[PDB]
Design a protein around this ligand. Sequence first.
Ligand SMILES: [Mg+2]
Ligand SMILES: [Mg+2]
Ligand SMILES: [Mg+2]
Ligand SMILES: [Mg+2]
Ligand SMILES: [Mg+2]
Ligand SMILES: [Mg+2]
Ligand SMILES: [Mg+2]
Ligand SMILES: [Mg+2]
Ligand SMILES: [Mg+2]
Ligand SMILES: [Mg+2]
Ligand SMILES: [Mg+2]
Ligand SMILES: [Mg+2]
Ligand SMILES: [Mg+2]
Ligand SMILES: [Mg+2]
Ligand SMILES: [Mg+2]
Ligand SMILES: [Mg+2]
Ligand SMILES: [Mg+2]
Ligand SMILES: [Mg+2]
Ligand SMILES: [Mg+2]
Ligand SMILES: [Mg+2]
Ligand SMILES: [Mg+2]
Ligand SMILES: [Mg+2]
Ligand SMILES: [Mg+2]
Ligand SMILES: [Mg+2]
Ligand SMILES: [Mg+2]
Ligand SMILES: [Mg+2]
Ligand SMILES: [Mg+2]
Ligand SMILES: [Mg+2]
Ligand SMILES: [Mg+2]
Ligand SMILES: [Mg+2]
Ligand SMILES: [Mg+2]
Ligand SMILES: [Mg+2]
Ligand SMILES: [Mg+2]
Ligand SMILES: [Mg+2]
Ligand SMILES: [Mg+2]
Ligand SMILES: [Mg+2]
Ligand SMILES: [Mg+2]
Ligand SMILES: [Mg+2]
Ligand SMILES: [Mg+2]
Ligand SMILES: [Mg+2]
Ligand SMILES: [Mg+2]
Ligand SMILES: [Mg+2]
Ligand SMILES: [Mg+2]
Ligand SMILES: [Mg+2]
Ligand SMILES: [Mg+2]
Ligand SMILES: [Mg+2]
Ligand SMILES: [Mg+2]
Ligand SMILES: [Mg+2]
Ligand SMILES: [Mg+2]
Ligand SMILES: [Mg+2]
Ligand SMILES: [Mg+2]
Ligand SMILES: [Mg+2]
Ligand SMILES: [Mg+2]
Ligand SMILES: [Mg+2]
Ligand SMILES: [Mg+2]
Ligand SMILES: [Mg+2]
Ligand SMILES: [Mg+2]
Ligand SMILES: [Mg+2]
Ligand SMILES: [Mg+2]
Ligand SMILES: [Mg+2]
Ligand SMILES: [Mg+2]
Ligand SMILES: [Mg+2]
Ligand SMILES: [Mg+2]
Ligand SMILES: [Mg+2]
Ligand SMILES: [Mg+2]
Ligand SMILES: [Mg+2]
Ligand SMILES: [Mg+2]
Ligand SMILES: [Mg+2]
Ligand SMILES: [Mg+2]
Ligand SMILES: [Mg+2]
Ligand SMILES: [Mg+2]
Ligand SMILES: [Mg+2]
Ligand SMILES: [Mg+2]
Ligand SMILES: [Mg+2]
Ligand SMILES: [Mg+2]
Ligand SMILES: [Mg+2]
Lengths: 271, 46
Amino acid sequence: AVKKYRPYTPSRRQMTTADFSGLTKKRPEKALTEALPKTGGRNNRGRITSRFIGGGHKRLYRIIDFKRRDKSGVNAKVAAIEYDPNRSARIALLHYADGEKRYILAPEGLTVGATVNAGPEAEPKLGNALPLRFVPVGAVVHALELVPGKGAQLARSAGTSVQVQGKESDYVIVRLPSGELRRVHSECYATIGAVGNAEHKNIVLGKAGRSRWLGRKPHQRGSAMNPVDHPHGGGEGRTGAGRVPVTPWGKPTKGLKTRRKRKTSDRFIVT
Amino acid sequence: MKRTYQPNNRKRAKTHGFRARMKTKSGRNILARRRAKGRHQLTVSD
RNA sequence: UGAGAAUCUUCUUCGCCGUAAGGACAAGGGUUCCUGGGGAAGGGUCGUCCGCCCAGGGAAAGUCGGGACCUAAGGUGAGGCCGAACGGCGCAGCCGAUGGACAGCAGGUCAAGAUUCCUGCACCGAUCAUGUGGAGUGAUGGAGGGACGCAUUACGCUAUCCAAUGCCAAGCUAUGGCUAUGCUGGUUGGUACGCUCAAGGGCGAUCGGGUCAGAAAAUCUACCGGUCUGCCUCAGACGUAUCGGGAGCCGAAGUUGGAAACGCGACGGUGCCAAGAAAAGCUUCUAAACGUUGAAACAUGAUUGCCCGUACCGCAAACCGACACAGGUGUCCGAGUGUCAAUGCACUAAGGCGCGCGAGAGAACCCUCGUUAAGGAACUUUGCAAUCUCACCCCGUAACUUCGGAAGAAGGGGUCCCCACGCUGCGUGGGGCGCAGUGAAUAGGCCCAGGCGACUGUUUACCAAAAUCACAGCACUCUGCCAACACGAACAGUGGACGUAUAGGGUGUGACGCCUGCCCGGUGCCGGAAGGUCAAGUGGAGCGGUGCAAGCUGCGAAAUGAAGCCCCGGUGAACGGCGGCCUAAGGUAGCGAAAUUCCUUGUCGGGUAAGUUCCGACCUGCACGAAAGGCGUAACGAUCUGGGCGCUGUCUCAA
RNA sequence: CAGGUGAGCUAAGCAUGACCAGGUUGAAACCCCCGGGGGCGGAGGACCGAACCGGUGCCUGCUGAAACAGUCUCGGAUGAGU
Ligand SMILES: [Mg+2]
Ligand SMILES: [Mg+2]
Ligand SMILES: [Mg+2]
Ligand SMILES: [Mg+2]
Ligand SMILES: [Mg+2]
Ligand SMILES: [Mg+2]
Ligand SMILES: [Mg+2]
Ligand SMILES: [Mg+2]
Ligand SMILES: [Mg+2]
Ligand SMILES: [Mg+2]
Ligand SMILES: [Mg+2]
Ligand SMILES: [Mg+2]
Ligand SMILES: [Mg+2]
Ligand SMILES: [Mg+2]
Ligand SMILES: [Mg+2]
Ligand SMILES: [Mg+2]
Ligand SMILES: [Mg+2]
Ligand SMILES: [Mg+2]
Ligand SMILES: [Mg+2]
Ligand SMILES: [Mg+2]
Ligand SMILES: [Mg+2]
Ligand SMILES: [Mg+2]
Ligand SMILES: [Mg+2]
Ligand SMILES: [Mg+2]
Ligand SMILES: [Mg+2]
Ligand SMILES: [Mg+2]
Ligand SMILES: [Mg+2]
Ligand SMILES: [Mg+2]
Ligand SMILES: [Mg+2]
Ligand SMILES: [Mg+2]
Ligand SMILES: [Mg+2]
Ligand SMILES: [Mg+2]
Ligand SMILES: [Mg+2]
Ligand SMILES: [Mg+2]
Ligand SMILES: [Mg+2]
Ligand SMILES: [Mg+2]
Ligand SMILES: [Mg+2]
Ligand SMILES: [Mg+2]
Ligand SMILES: [Mg+2]
Ligand SMILES: [Mg+2]
Ligand SMILES: [Mg+2]
Ligand SMILES: [Mg+2]
Ligand SMILES: [Mg+2]
Ligand SMILES: [Mg+2]
Ligand SMILES: [Mg+2]
Ligand SMILES: [Mg+2]
Ligand SMILES: [Mg+2]
Ligand SMILES: [Mg+2]
Ligand SMILES: [Mg+2]
Ligand SMILES: [Mg+2]
Ligand SMILES: [Mg+2]
Ligand SMILES: [Mg+2]
Ligand SMILES: [Mg+2]
Ligand SMILES: [Mg+2]
Ligand SMILES: [Mg+2]
Ligand SMILES: [Mg+2]
Ligand SMILES: [Mg+2]
Ligand SMILES: [Mg+2]
Ligand SMILES: [Mg+2]
Ligand SMILES: [Mg+2]
Ligand SMILES: [Mg+2]
Ligand SMILES: [Mg+2]
Ligand SMILES: [Mg+2]
Ligand SMILES: [Mg+2]
Ligand SMILES: [Mg+2]
Ligand SMILES: [Mg+2]
Ligand SMILES: [Mg+2]
Ligand SMILES: [Mg+2]
Ligand SMILES: [Mg+2]
Ligand SMILES: [Mg+2]
Ligand SMILES: [Mg+2]
Ligand SMILES: [Mg+2]
Ligand SMILES: [Mg+2]
Ligand SMILES: [Mg+2]
Ligand SMILES: [Mg+2]
Ligand SMILES: [Mg+2]
């Protein structure tokens, strides 16, 4: 039920915009928004690093709880799902029995006011934070830790899901959104189910600047650069030869990972 | 038709100023190089 | 005036700007300000004058701006992380306004200062005293709050401007008239007090429970349960008083109707998605500590009020342009008449100015212009330029289409003055005047048909704005999180990213539609990894010296040694190739004399009297072709090409 | 080639403030009559046009008024804006 438009303007017909009806229209939470994002592409020395990051709308951070481990054994009521910049996923406010308010990722479904139970012994309801050991095999889960503590690092974009597979003495295999079959420690927490706002992916931008509103400066082809600025140099017409990037390499097929100790910690099936 | 020199006092002294030059070995070199040449001015501080 | 005057002073006309060419600020300049004097040089001429030379004055703050407060980016930075050196980072803290915070307004005036000084009357904090009160204060820590987007938009109101036979003030007038109902000018600012009128705006309120929340505390917050329109508020108006100001010859009047802000009420409503600082001041809590018969607080009196800035120029003759420079320069205010509206256009108030050589004369030629017989694009690379079109209202508008548009298509009609009538300035009738009625100024030429690019946009400061670049959309490909990727003396630190595969990086195509064929041989890459080859290293069998010898010592194989290359598959939205009377293949659709056609003015048709151009077919494609994308596409273009209408001194041919 | 000086012009980023007369068009959504008509509403890298931003074509200027401008004409003008 994404919003559409008639073509009253040349670039309005192809645009798409997300359905905000279920989001609660409210201010983010004054304590949970430490705010202060510098929003610079320039890095520690003022030299451009991730190229083409540019202006766009100013945002604030709102702190999100990724570990979800200090509240073990405590129930939480879902105050209000609400919008958030800097995430493909919508987030849910939740109030704890001791009265602490805290933010979390929103799973698919989860109507406002649903109870949620963090901890070891909490049941595989939607929204609970669980160790991999108590999770039944094959269930949809997101917000997955790579290490105990730290916090969730896997599955956190909108609509991503992780699949438990088999189990070892401690380590539990899971299917990553790439389809990678990676092992993960039993004590890692996860949130059951898929992430909310499942169909972010179909939004159509519909005009140039609308990505500027996202802070993405125009991305030049190196087909246009002079040979000074890119290995696709001049050439009096238009082409390419050899297929290499900015600093030269292979963008079509080249293995790029290194020879880390991580490689033995996953079954080789990948992407 | 805008010209090269838009004066600005805080900019003129934040760059170029004696305290600014003293922060850096190059600027202390500028200072002694001027004292040796014997200029009356030495900096935009004067 | 003066030695000397077109230019200096004054007077009276004149003309010129008036969302400025008026006024106030910020910069930034630095005495350019005022007074008296001067005349070398600077002033594009003069000069008795000046922004020039000389001398002397002017510049006043508890409340305005900053500081004795706070924080953003940024810069620092004891400790700390690194690094041939110099140094590079770096948590807290600190600096750092462009932002947050905060106590006065009305009037007067030196030649030259003004929310500063003087006058009237306020406020602020601090100390102390008198008294009420006569006890709780209540932290570098907790909590609230401060705290924020955009577009629209309802109601009240002010600033402020308009009208009048409202008031007030002063005098005339005459030309032909008006004797004022004519003319001109003025027609309130602050403060205090109201059983005065007032839209709009804010706010629910305690009792209790739980520890797992705010470090612990907490009577303050958060969570959780139980409990019953009203308050507060003045924007602003009105009255009384008072203190000012007030046209004017010391001091009059201060009315009625209307208009109306971006300003005020307010932190209003509503809609939207791109989801819109921090921090102290401030309100509320306890910790520690100090007391609880000299509290918190309040009232009055008194006392204290530091530093820096303030002159003048400040869209420019005082700043940036080497100049008294046609250039630029951020913010604020910017009246009236008319014209749908307006900061537009024309005239003008206030205010400000005529641009620091002048005077003649009315040749050629040159620059900006006005009119032009007849003809009308014949001119020319091209209608380049100059006409023509011109605002508002009514009627009417195609092929095509993505159904929104093309569209202001095209085309026609009205437009002024008076009177009666109807409705809330319009419409209805009638009359009138001219050549002419958006009467002067501002104010679209339009149509048909191509090529290219979908589109808004972006660009070569100063010869190129386009068909370039970017763009949404698509595709390949990588990257499992100290992510790939990049800056970097660096196991430093950062960016990616306080993001985590619906995300991030790169590459190329470039909305939308139908689509995107053949060829893994080379090159790249991804897999395999029976075998070929391959470094140091492990090994040291043997070949030699030199010693009487022990021994020392120079070489030194075989085998065994990784990645990698040779080898074997595959991969094209990888680099590419898809032709010359064997190569891995040899052109699927679509198009074709192209932006690609050499021969070339190809042939036929179209359009013109005449067509190297142009359009449609044909195909013999020198030398098209499928995401270095192929074929289309509505809409779009200061884009290029061809045509036609319209009107024009582009032209016959110039006056 | 070395070590410096320069982002006060200009090329971008960041923090924080500010600016964009007026008129035209009338998207959703919401509400009635049967996707169509009416109302209502006020959306847009919408239209026209001042500031402002920009430089499209001729001409003038060419020991300039100006070391890149001037008259006239033209592009945008709530957005990828200044
Ligand atoms: Mg792209
Ligand atoms: Mg180039
Ligand atoms: Mg290169
Ligand atoms: Mg190249
Ligand atoms: Mg080429
Ligand atoms: Mg690179
Ligand atoms: Mg210059
Ligand atoms: Mg000094
Ligand atoms: Mg005399
Ligand atoms: Mg003389
Ligand atoms: Mg006289
Ligand atoms: Mg002025
Ligand atoms: Mg100054
Ligand atoms: Mg003077
Ligand atoms: Mg004088
Ligand atoms: Mg003289
Ligand atoms: Mg002279
Ligand atoms: Mg004079
Ligand atoms: Mg002072
Ligand atoms: Mg005073
Ligand atoms: Mg202050
Ligand atoms: Mg540092
Ligand atoms: Mg600061
Ligand atoms: Mg300020
Ligand atoms: Mg104040
Ligand atoms: Mg006096
Ligand atoms: Mg004065
Ligand atoms: Mg606005
Ligand atoms: Mg009258
Ligand atoms: Mg208390
Ligand atoms: Mg303004
Ligand atoms: Mg502080
Ligand atoms: Mg002054
Ligand atoms: Mg001064
Ligand atoms: Mg010059
Ligand atoms: Mg000038
Ligand atoms: Mg005005
Ligand atoms: Mg006006
Ligand atoms: Mg008017
Ligand atoms: Mg005007
Ligand atoms: Mg002046
Ligand atoms: Mg004059
Ligand atoms: Mg002319
Ligand atoms: Mg004629
Ligand atoms: Mg004709
Ligand atoms: Mg001819
Ligand atoms: Mg022509
Ligand atoms: Mg041409
Ligand atoms: Mg023309
Ligand atoms: Mg049809
Ligand atoms: Mg239609
Ligand atoms: Mg028309
Ligand atoms: Mg007549
Ligand atoms: Mg008529
Ligand atoms: Mg007229
Ligand atoms: Mg005229
Ligand atoms: Mg284009
Ligand atoms: Mg446009
Ligand atoms: Mg150029
Ligand atoms: Mg040009
Ligand atoms: Mg590290
Ligand atoms: Mg391309
Ligand atoms: Mg031909
Ligand atoms: Mg052709
Ligand atoms: Mg083509
Ligand atoms: Mg022919
Ligand atoms: Mg043809
Ligand atoms: Mg291709
Ligand atoms: Mg193309
Ligand atoms: Mg068009
Ligand atoms: Mg354009
Ligand atoms: Mg033509
Ligand atoms: Mg627009
Ligand atoms: Mg149009
Ligand atoms: Mg430009
Ligand atoms: Mg136009």
